[PDB]
Ligand binder design. Structure first.
Ligand SMILES: Nc1ncnc2c1ncn2[C@@H]1O[C@H](COP(=O)(O)CP(=O)(O)OP(=O)(O)O)[C@@H](O)[C@H]1O
Ligand SMILES: [Mg+2]
Ligand SMILES: [Zn+2]
Ligand SMILES: [Zn+2]
Ligand SMILES: [Zn+2]
Lengths: 86, 65, 196, 264, 180, 158, 133, 559, 114, 160, 43
RNA sequence: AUCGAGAGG
């Protein structure tokens, strides 16, 4: 219930971003770009929100934290900047 | 249903021959191949239009209405 | 389609100048890919080409009756008497370039049949369309401007891909979405909600 | 004569002309064949309006047949495309209007031929729209058969057109090509179970070129400049005019490319 | 057909009988019909249970006495090595049904393909009847220029397919091209 | 020997000698010690479960045991110098590329292992079409549903 | 920028297998046991007489796009009847102090073994084969 | 079962499909009218607003257009009928239902949905004619073919949904299948047949054809490869023109029984830095396989490069084959007379052996083996004799077949055909099998009423001596028909059974997935497996690799 | 139904230049021309005649799709030599050959008797 | 049968071995019989193997025969999928078939259960026992229309 | 039309399989596909 | 809508 979160120290989730979570982050960022939300990377000849989200992922500027659940209910939180994308 | 105007492959006009072609085989007991040669349809593409086609028009004519 | 079970859909149409031409100028009405034949093992298509060419040149109807002693060698002897190659293979020239084709090409007259299944008659599409009332879901059939069924197998094919939001959009927003009010103690739809 | 390509004509007929083309790259001859087949323009019925039809044949069927009927197009150059004219629908200068009316007065069936079609629009002293008859009897090509009590009446508008838009305007039926009949260039690989020479038929044109010798090596450098061809005319345009008009159509295409470049 | 003793076993039906049947075919003298042959006893009707007792021969020429340089192309036929056939098949093609009798050289093709073609003959475009223009039909489809097939079965004559065809003899090329 | 394994080490080796042009005559610059130490360090590096606790570490060691066997087979110190003229940079690049490929080769969490397995079995089953032993889709049905009777029960004794 | 190897070889036998244009040729270096060469040739392009003795040369040169041969503007690198371009895949030794060179000129395989030149025919992308009657 | 998990879907389409070699593998040929009917909601955005406005001025009937406009309040605006359809001024935040435009994610589906590869996301190219057009290489994972087949397409309606389709369901990602450790897509058509012919050392391209083929490659950098032969004439091997298509810095090695480094037979393959050193390309080289060419290119370079490679190979091979020509033929089926007579004496030897074995069975001299009926042993021996006869006749035909034989070309490439097809069409079609037995006596002691009583000879037993070319006898036709009918019955019942089996499998374990602790468990939490596959590694990366330690002698291991 | 009108393939359309010229990226003295509303008939002659000229290094044409009729021609020439000049020289030589052949065949036809 | 065995030198060798095949199976008596190798015995029937030896052995035999039916047609499937299904059957109690009874006896969510077969009866029994469904199953959220906790949906996304 | 005129249906030791007894009475190959195979045949 | 029939992969 309360304090279900695992502390940051000795995090046991995968350092690499699962393809599902990068896909979800790109989808949400493209959604908010199409919603006229502010963009934190300069754009060079791009009008499509999803490509902008990809560029932001490469710049790693997109702020969001993935809540990765565990079977017991404990959740580990990983910021986008901490996660590495290959 | 009626004699094709031109062979789809050859493009040469083939309708004008038909009326003579029949008379060629009935009047002189001519072979079909020799009749087609007399028509000048050397290629088999123009030959097939004459040989394979059948005049369904004649059956259609018989109905008075 | 033709006799012997060959089934075909014309992926494109070519004007006669684009298409390859034989030395005598005859261009094929249709052209079929070779690879369909070896798996079906239908020799009668090839012998029909041969005998139909022999019949067109000879003026004598070809005998396609089964259980009749017809030698392919004999029909090829007749075709050689006509002057065309015994196997029916004929030198052909590419239409676009005018150059002789390296491999000689086999073409002859053959019976073909048009089929009830017509592309223009079959095409169907649906935007936001009419919905059957009982399920509040798209009606059936092209005639009623209906919507295609999302099969259970298709549901699983999307499930294992991980497109959870795609499945949610396709299965909730795209069809029979609804909003209801439930009271906490009740746990049912009984609660009557007045929105105005 | 003139330095360049040279033609030696083996045979000639109003219908078919046989010739030998020399000192030519193959691409030129092929593109000329394509222009001759499709790109040469002629006159053909682009519109049919039927007022009465008692025949068994339906009107659309008949209209397709009428489109395929040959009409004289020797003076087609003086006529102008309907789309290029300023007429509302059609002009006497751009289109030729014909009328066809027939009734099966006889209990015996009366046929419809190309001799039965007549022209309304002003000729303006040009040889356009004359029905073409190669029949020995002089009767035109059959269109329909009429039993007693059957009447057909219609009006045709014939416009200028190019066979690329529809096969009807094509002025030629069969084009016969043959180059390298001995296969000295070896551009094709023969298929043979026992022997190529026995199974394969020697070409007629093959006899005109000099026979090869096996001992002589295959000339890599060799390229074929000698070609043998035969052209066929439906009778809408004479053979010589058909090939000359193909030449002129190709030169006009090239000139249009050059003119677009000058505008560039 | 019926086989009985003559001193070799010989087909009951003979040449003059065929000539009389052909003469009655030409007029359309005394009528020669299949009922006449049944009453004459030159032919019989066999159900499935009665077939068990009888013995049949595909080809009449098997009954004629036997006795090399046989042509290689001809299909291999086992010597019958049998006698006392009660009956001889009129012609093997009669086992095939109406849709199969259209198929050209089905003996040279695998049977499943013949089955598939028998399924497609129903879907084949064709002129169903000459009364089409007079008849009102919910759906009717007809070819612009129907043409008889170049190669025909003998049974096709009695199917009236040549008289009322349902396909076009198109020039067909087996070739590799653009890739469509 | 032929078994499904990840990272495809031999391909990395061909890429090694082509990416770094290799002169066969020149001796390898790699000291003998460095090859063994680097292979051990790489064995430590190829982690598949993130936890450092001893039981998850043991599961990780067992899980990567076979891959380590292959890695040792293709990275033997005699093998490295003899088969190819490995340089220190080439060996380190091979190590890093093997680690990267192994990391890519880990299953992405959240993937629906189930439906994928089910369809993986389903696809060839449709392809399966028609001597004394049950086979085909009837045999597969017998396998799937616990059958008190088998059509072809058989016992092979050795 | 000079030729890598020169020699004269006489063909022991010529055998084309499953190809009409391309034959396979076998030979050894004249007077030398250590060097022998076997390679593919287009006999239709250049007929190879049986028992014929022919001169064989390999040169490094004489990237950059190929230009059609200038009509005498650039002088011929060779009067040799036949020439090919090829690249080496691997060099091996049949024995210690015994060298073998492996090449493939446009898919036409070439193999020559010999110790008479070790530095030359060094592994490189560029290689040319020149053959005179 | 059918309304909660089988709901009919809005924004769907369906069409007869045909194949387009020029069309890119990733794309689908969506018809214009379909793209007109299909709408995507897009919020008006400062970057695209101009374009959006333009679409609304074109109108719904002509694409690119738009069918509907949604205000901030949400009251609908219909472009087909409205007084303001021409003077619209889009306020920010409004929705425009744009037509489906090129380079938009769509979901392409083949009807038997037994495979993830049957449902895959494609790019859209809007094309004139009404048939859906797909690439020839994408047919196999869908199991589709252009015999009249119909396929479905779906269009996402939200941005994160488009992103999910592009980031997960895209064709390039699904190019390497999880099952089989193998790619799905492969080059299997005329392209495969002609790639072998082009790679033949006999085949040589000419300068003009070389330039046209080089230009055909889209990513062509402009390098003109040096001709393989120069002085006699500038000629190029097909290997060079194909190597232009091979990406830089790729290395492939193929080993078979005859892959000498010399490689006189030209079997096997070697590619270094995208250059093909030796060999002739075939189905193993290109067609999807463990450690295949597509597999390597997908593994190292990435998916996009390998899809482009698909396209480039198809373009080059198709142009070359178009200019070279190819055909099946009746003469390709016809075999040499002497070889045919050798096949007939093979048949006669088989018949005599069967006769002698039957005669032994008549004398009761043979002794059965343990657990076997005498009749069973007789049936097995005769069956094996006839099988050997058919296979031997086919082998004689195959040795007699020449290299020019077109069926042999198709088989050598691997595009189509098999040894049994060649044998059945050429020499002998084999012995017919019904319910796992030779042809039985439906009538008592006679298979057919024409046959005599108690005949166990091969003609009565249903072995068809004649080939397809030679012509089947009537009895043989009926026997073959029985066999084919059993085949059709089996296929129908098999499709039903396999559908039920796949449904039960999918429903059984649909829940199971890898959780974030790498354990594989269900919703209740019960652990099916602690590590997926016991190693926790994705199946697409796995490929067969040899282990040197396990094999060999101890002495070789030491050395 | 969906089929484009036939007149499109022989006649130009609105907003369509007959020729569009764009230099090839990362190539020396090379440019691609998008002939619009044209077919193989026109392209083959241009390619062959450019190949005849020594100064024209490259000569090839392609159709991006058999559906609609357009063809791209790629030309690379010697430095100091404009590609458009090569194209126009090839065109003019083509025209001269056409005229010469037409005169010769007209004379032959007049010589012929039928 | 030809079988691979290690030679004295360690290389592959293949020595012929006599094997016996039986058309009936009574394993418990057969293994005790002398003259047979107790470690090499194998049976077609999985259930007898599970009863005689142990559940893991039965799992292995089950995977082996599934492998056999796959390889008879020449097709190949990677081990992980078959292993997942075999372990799905193996994990609970004895052996659980892929049938209506196989899934329904499981205590999973009621809706995922009702999807397969006996829909109304499963729902009735859930209603009578006042069974609580967690809604965590995929099919249950498919029916609910809510996005399933699958792939994309498994991880939550929170703002800074 | 003719093939529909000559139609047989078998409502339902294995009926679908073509039988030796069917020779000369039933067409060997004119059977519909799907579930109708074997049960329905043309004479 | 219901039921049924036929047909396509
Ligand atoms: N990989 C393959 N994909 C598609 N068809 C193939 C194929 N291999 C062979 N075929 C052909 O499939 C044909 C069988 O016809 P059908 O079963 O109706 C098409 P199918 O794809 O096999 O199954 P379907 O009925 O689900 O469409 C055979 O003639 C065979 O040549
Ligand atoms: Mg299909
Ligand atoms: Zn014709
Ligand atoms: Zn309440
Ligand atoms: Zn006008």
């Amino acid at each position: 219930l309360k304090e279900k979160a695992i502390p940051k120290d000795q995090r046991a989730t995968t350092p690499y971003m699962t393809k599902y979570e990068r896909a979800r982050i790109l989808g949400t960022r493209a959604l908010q770009i199409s919603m006229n939300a502010p963009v934190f990377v300069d754009l060079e000849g791009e009008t499509d929100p999803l490509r902008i989200a990809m560029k932001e992922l490469a710049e790693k500027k997109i702020p969001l934290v993935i809540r990765r659940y565990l079977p017991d209910g404990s959740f580990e939180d990983w910021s986008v900047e901490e996660l590495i994308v290959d | 249903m009626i004699v094709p105007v031109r062979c789809f492959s050859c493009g040469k006009v083939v309708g004008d021959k038909w009326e003579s072609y029949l008379n060629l085989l009935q009047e002189d007991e001519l072979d079909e191949g020799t009749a087609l040669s007399r028509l000048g349809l050397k290629r088999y593409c123009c030959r097939r239009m004459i040989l394979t086609h059948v005049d369904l028009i004649e059956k259609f004519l018989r109905y008075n209405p | 389609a033709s006799r012997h079970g060959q089934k075909g859909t014309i992926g494109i149409t070519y004007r006669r100048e684009d298409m390859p031409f034989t030395a005598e100028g005859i261009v094929p009405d249709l052209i079929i890919n070779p690879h369909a034949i070896p798996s079906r093992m239908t020799v009668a298509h090839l012998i029909e080409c041969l005998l139909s060419k022999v019949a067109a040149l000879s003026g004598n109807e070809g005998d396609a009756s089964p259980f009749t002693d017809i030698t392919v060698e004999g029909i090829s002897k007749l075709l050689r008497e006509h002057g065309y190659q015994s196997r029916g293979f004929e030198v052909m020239y590419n239409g676009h370039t005018g150059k002789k084709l390296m491999a000689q090409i086999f073409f002859g007259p053959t019976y073909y049949q048009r089929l009830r299944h017509m592309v223009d008659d079959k095409i169907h599409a649906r935007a936001r369309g009419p919905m059957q009332v009982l399920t509040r879901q798209p009606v059936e059939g092209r005639s009623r401007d209906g919507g295609l069924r999302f099969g259970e197998m298709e549901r699983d094919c999307m499930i294992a891909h991980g497109a959870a939001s795609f499945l949610k959009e396709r299965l909730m927003e795209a069809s029979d979405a609804f909003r209801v009010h439930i009271c906490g103690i009740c746990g049912l739809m009984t609660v009557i909600a007045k929105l105005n | 004569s003139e330095e360049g390509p040279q033609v030696k004509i083996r045979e000639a007929s109003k219908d078919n002309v046989d010739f030998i083309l020399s000192n030519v790259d193959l691409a030129m001859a092929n593109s000329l064949r394509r222009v001759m087949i499709a790109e040469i323009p002629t006159l053909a019925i682009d519109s049919v309006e039927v007022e009465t039809n008692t025949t068994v044949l339906a009107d659309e069927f008949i209209a397709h047949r009428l489109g395929l009927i040959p009409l004289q197009s020797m003076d087609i150059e003086q006529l102008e495309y309907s789309r290029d004219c300023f007429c509302e629908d059609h002009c006497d200068k751009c289109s030729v209007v014909l009328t066809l009316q027939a009734f099966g007065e006889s209990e015996s069936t009366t046929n419809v031929y190309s001799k039965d079609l007549v022209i309304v629009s002003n000729l303006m002293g040009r040889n356009i729209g004359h029905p073409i008859i190669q029949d020995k009897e002089g009767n035109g090509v059959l269109i329909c058969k009429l039993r007693k009590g059957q009447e057909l009446k219609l009006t045709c508008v014939a416009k200028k057109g190019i066979a690329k838009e529809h096969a009807k305007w094509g002025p030629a039926a069969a084009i016969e090509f043959e180059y390298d009949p001995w296969n000295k260039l070896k551009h094709t690989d023969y298929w043979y179970e026992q022997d190529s020479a026995k199974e394969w038929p020697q070409s007629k044109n093959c006899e005109y070129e000099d026979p090869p010798n096996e001992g002589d090596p295959f000339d890599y450098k060799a390229q074929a400049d000698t070609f043998y061809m035969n052209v066929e005319s439906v009778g809408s345009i004479p053979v010589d005019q058909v090939v000359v008009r193909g030449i002129d159509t190709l030169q006009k295409k090239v000139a249009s490319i050059l003119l677009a470049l000058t505008q560039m | 057909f019926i086989v009985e003793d003559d001193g070799h076993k010989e087909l009951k039906v003979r040449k003059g009988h065929i000539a009389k049947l052909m003469a009655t075919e030409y007029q359309d003298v005394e009528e020669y019909t299949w009922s006449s042959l049944l009453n004459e006893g030159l032919v019989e009707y066999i159900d499935a249970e009665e077939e068990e007792s009888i013995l049949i021969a595909m080809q009449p020429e098997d009954l004629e006495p036997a006795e090399l340089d046989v042509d290689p192309a001809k299909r291999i036929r086992v010597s019958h090595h049998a006698t006392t056939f009660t009956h001889c098949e009129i012609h093997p093609s009669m086992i095939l049904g109406v849709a199969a009798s259209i198929i050209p050289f089905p003996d040279h093709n695998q049977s499943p393909r013949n089955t598939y073609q028998s399924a497609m003959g129903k879907q084949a475009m064709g002129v169903f009847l000459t009364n089409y223009n007079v008849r009102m039909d919910t759906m009717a489809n007809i070819l612009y220029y129907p043409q008889k097939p170049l190669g025909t079965t003998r049974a096709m004559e009695y199917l009236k397919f040549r008289e009322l065809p349902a396909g076009q003899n198109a020039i067909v090329a087996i070739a590799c091209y653009s890739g469509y | 020997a032929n078994w499904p394994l990840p990272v495809n080490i031999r391909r990395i080796i061909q890429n090694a000698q082509q990416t770094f042009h290799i002169d066969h005559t020149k001796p390898s610059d790699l000291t003998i010690k460095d090859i063994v130490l680097g292979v051990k360090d790489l064995q430590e590096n190829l982690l598949v479960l993130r936890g450092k606790n001893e039981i998850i570490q043991n599961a990780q060691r067992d899980a990567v045991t076979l891959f380590c066997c292959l890695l040792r087979s293709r990275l033997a110190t005699r093998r490295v110098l003899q088969e190819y003229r490995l340089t220190k940079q080439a060996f380190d690049w091979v190590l890093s590329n093997i680690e990267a490929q192994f990391l890519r080769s880990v299953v992405h969490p959240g993937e629906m292992v189930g439906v994928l397995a089910a369809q993986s079995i389903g696809e060839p089953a449709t392809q399966m079409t028609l001597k004394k032993v049950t086979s085909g889709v009837p045999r597969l049905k017998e396998i799937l549903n616990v059958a008190k009777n088998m059509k072809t029960p058989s016992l092979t004794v050795y | 920028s000079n030729t890598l190897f020169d020699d004269i070889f006489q063909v022991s036998e010529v055998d084309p297998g499953r190809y009409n244009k391309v034959c396979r040729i076998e030979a050894a270096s004249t007077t030398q046991d250590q060097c022998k060469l076997t390679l593919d040739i287009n006999v239709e392009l250049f007929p190879v007489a049986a028992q014929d003795s022919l001169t064989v040369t390999i040169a490094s040169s004489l990237t950059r796009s190929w230009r059609p041969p200038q009509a005498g503007d650039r002088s011929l690198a060779d009067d040799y009847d036949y020439v090919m371009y090829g690249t080496a895949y691997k060099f091996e030794e049949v024995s210690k102090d015994l060298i073998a060179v492996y090449y493939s000129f446009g898919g036409l395989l070439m193999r020559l073994e010999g110790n008479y030149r070790n530095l030359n025919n060094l592994k490189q992308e560029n290689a040319y084969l020149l053959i005179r009657r | 079962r059918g309304n909660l998990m089988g709901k009919r879907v809005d924004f769907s389409a369906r069409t007869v499909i045909s194949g387009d070699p020029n069309l890119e593998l990733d794309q689908v040929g969506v018809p214009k009218s379909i793209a007109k009917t299909l709408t995507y909601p897009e919020v008006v955005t400062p970057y695209n607003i101009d374009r959006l406005t333009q679409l609304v001025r074109n109108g719904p009937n002509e694409h690119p257009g738009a069918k509907y406009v949604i205000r901030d309040s949400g009251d609908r605006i219909d472009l087909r009928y409205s007084k303001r359809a021409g003077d619209i001024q889009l306020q920010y935040g409004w929705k425009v239902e744009r037509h489906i435009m090129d380079n938009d994610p769509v979901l392409f589906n083949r009807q038997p949905s037994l495979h993830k590869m049957s449902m895959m996301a494609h790019r859209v190219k809007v094309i004139p004619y009404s048939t859906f057009r797909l690439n020839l290489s994408v047919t196999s994972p869908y199991n589709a073919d252009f015999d009249g087949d119909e396929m479905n397409l779906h269009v996402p309606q939200s941005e994160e949904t488009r992103a999910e389709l592009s980031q997960l369901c895209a064709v390039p990602l699904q190019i390497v299948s999880p099952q089989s450790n193998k790619p799905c897509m492969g080059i299997v058509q005329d392209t495969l047949c002609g790639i072998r012919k082009l790679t033949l050392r006999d085949t040589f391209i000419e300068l003009d054809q070389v330039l046209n083929m080089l230009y055909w490659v889209p990513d062509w950098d402009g390098v003109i490869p040096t001709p393989a032969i120069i002085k006699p004439k500038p000629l190029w091997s097909g290997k060079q023109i194909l190597s232009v298509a091979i990406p830089n810095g790729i290395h492939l090695q193929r080993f078979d029984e005859g892959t000498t480094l010399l490689s006189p037979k030209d079997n096997g393959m070697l590619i270094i830095d995208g250059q093909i050193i030796f060999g002739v390309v075939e189905k193993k080289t290109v067609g999807s396989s463990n450690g295949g060419l597509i597999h390597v290119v997908t593994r190292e370079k990435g998916p996009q490069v390998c899809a482009k490679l698909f396209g480039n190979i198809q373009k080059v091979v198709n142009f070359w084959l178009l200019h070279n020509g190819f055909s099946t033929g009746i003469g390709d089926t016809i075999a040499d007379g002497p070889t045919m007579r050798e096949i007939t004496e093979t048949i006669a030897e088989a018949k005599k052996k069967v006769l002698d074995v039957t005669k032994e069975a008549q004398a009761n001299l043979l002794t059965a083996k343990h657990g076997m009926t005498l009749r069973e042993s007789f049936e097995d021996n005769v069956v094996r004799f006839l099988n050997e006869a058919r296979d031997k006749a086919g082998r004689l035909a195959e040795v007699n077949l020449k290299d020019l034989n077109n069926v042999k070309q198709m088989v050598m490439a691997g595009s189509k055909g098999s040894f049994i097809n060649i044998a059945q069409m050429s020499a002998c079609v084999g012995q017919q099998s019904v319910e796992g037995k030779r042809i039985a006596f439906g009538f008592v002691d006679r298979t057919l009423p024409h046959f005599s009583k108690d005949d166990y000879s091969p003609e009565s037993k249903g072995f068809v001596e004649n080939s397809y070319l030679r012509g089947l006898t009537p009895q043989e036709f009926f026997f073959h028909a029985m066999g084919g009918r059993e085949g059709l019955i089996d296929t129908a019942v098999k499709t039903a059974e396999t559908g039920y089996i796949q449904r039960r499998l999918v429903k059984a374990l649909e829940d199971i997935m890898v959780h974030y602790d790498n354990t594989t468990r269900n919703s209740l939490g019960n652990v099916i497996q602690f590590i997926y596959g016991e190693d926790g590694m994705d199946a697409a990366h796995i490929e067969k690799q040899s282990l040197d330690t396990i094999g060999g002698s101890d002495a070789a291991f030491e050395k | 139904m969906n089929a484009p009108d036939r007149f499109e393939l022989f006649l130009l359309g609105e907003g369509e230049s007959k020729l569009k010229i764009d230099p090839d990226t990362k190539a020396p003295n090379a440019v691609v021309i998008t002939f619009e509303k044209e077919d193989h008939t026109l392209g083959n002659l241009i390619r062959a005649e450019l190949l005849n000229d020594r100064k024209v290094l490259f000569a090839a044409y392609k159709v991006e799709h058999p559906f609609f009729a357009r063809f791209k021609l790629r030309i690379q020439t010697t430095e100091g030599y404009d590609p458009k000049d090569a194209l126009k020289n090839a065109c003019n030589s083509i025209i001269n050959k056409l005229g010469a052949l037409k005169t010769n065949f007209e004379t032959e036809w007049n010589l012929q008797t039928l | 049968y030809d079988r691979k065995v290690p030679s004295p030198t360690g290389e592959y060798v293949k020595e012929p071995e006599w094997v016996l095949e039986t058309d009936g199976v009574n394993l418990s008596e057969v293994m005790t019989v002398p003259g047979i190798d107790p470690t090499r015995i194998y049976t077609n029937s999985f259930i007898d193997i599970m009863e005689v030896l142990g559940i893991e052995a039965g799992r292995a035999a089950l995977y082996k025969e599934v492998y056999n039916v796959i390889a008879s047609d020449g097709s190949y499937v990677n081990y992980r999928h078959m292993a997942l299904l075999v372990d799905v059957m193996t994990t609970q109690g004895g052996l659980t078939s892929v049938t209506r009874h196989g899934f329904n006896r499981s205590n999973t969510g009621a809706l995922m259960r009702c999807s397969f077969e006996e829909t109304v009866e499963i729902l009735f029994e859930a209603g009578a026992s006042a069974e609580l469904d967690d809604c965590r199953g995929v099919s249950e959220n498919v029916i609910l229309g809510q996005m399933a906790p699958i792939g994309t949906g498994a991880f939550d996304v929170m703002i800074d | 039309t003719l093939s529909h005129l000559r139609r047989t249906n078998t409502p339902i030791a294995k009926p679908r399989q073509l039988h030796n007894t069917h020779w000369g009475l039933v067409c060997p190959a004119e059977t519909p596909e799907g579930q109708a195979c074997g049960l329905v045949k043309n004479l």
